[PDB]
Amino acid sequence: SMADAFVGTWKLVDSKNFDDYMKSLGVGFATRQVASMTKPTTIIEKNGDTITIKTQSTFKNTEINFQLGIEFDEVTADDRKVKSLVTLDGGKLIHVQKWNGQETTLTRELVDGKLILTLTHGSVVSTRTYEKE
Ligand SMILES: CCCCCCCCCCCCCCCC(=O)O
């Protein structure tokens, strides 16, 4: 499936408005200070219909395991306890998180060999560019 092309190890090389995105979510000053400095590595694995996404950095590490279209519980890096759903739309992996009546969407797409992660919360949009190792 289109999800197979995402498999690999990816390193952050560019970031726009991630602090705005964290501030919109309610991430505090001290975590924002450090998180703005991180250049995470994301490792994406797929085993049959189970997809694993690890995000790793010197600050915080996260891991999620999911199947497309099946809701799962997630505890985000900023300790939101969210209900999450990931689906494929064309070539885009769309990850929607919901908590406390709020919602944010993390979209992953391959563009010219790079992984573009778009983070949307309300009107705030952050774009994170990852390069394959
Ligand atoms: C796990 C390393 C990420 C460092 C940031 C931790 C505090 C902010 C968390 C906000 C939501 C997570 C957004 C993911 C960003 C990404 O994968 O590049």
Author numbering: 0 to 132
Which passages does the manuscript contain on this structure?
H-FABP is mainly expressed in cardiomyocytes, skeletal muscle, and several other tissues such as the brain, adrenal gland, kidney, mammary gland, and blastocysts. Known FABP members are composed of 10 anti-parallel beta strands that form a β-barrel structure capped by a short helix-turn-helix motif. In cardiomyocytes, H-FABP binds to long-chain FAs and transports them from the cytoplasmic membrane to the sites of lipidation and hydrogenation, where FAs are eventually oxidized to produce ATP and provide energy for myocardial contraction.
The protein was crystallized from 25% PEG 2000 MME, 0.1 M HEPES pH 7.5 and 25% PEG 4000, 0.1 M sodium cacodylate pH 6.5. Both the Matthews coefficient analysis and the self-rotation function suggest the presence of one molecule per asymmetric unit in the mouse H-FABP crystal. One ligand molecule, the palmitic acid, was determined to be present inside the barrel cavity of H-FABP per asymmetric unit. The FABP–palmitic acid complex was formed during the expression of the FABP protein in E. coli. H-FABP adopted a β-barrel-like conformation, composed of 3 α-helices (α1: 35–39, α2: 51–58, α3: 62–68) and 10 anti-parallel β-strands (β1: 41–49, β2: 74–80, β3: 83–89, β4: 94–99, β5: 105–109, β6: 112–122, β7: 125–132, β8: 135–144, β9: 147–154, β10: 157–165). Notably, the lack of backbone hydrogen bonds between β4 and β5 prevented the two strands from forming a typical anti-parallel β-sheet. Instead, hydrophobic interactions were observed among the nonpolar residues of β4 (I97 and F99) and β5 (F105), conceivably stabilizing the β-barrel and the ligand’s nonpolar tail. The Arg161 and Tyr163, which localized in β10, had direct interaction with the carboxylate group of FA. Comparatively, mouse H-FABP has one more α-helix (α1) around the helix-turn-helix structure.
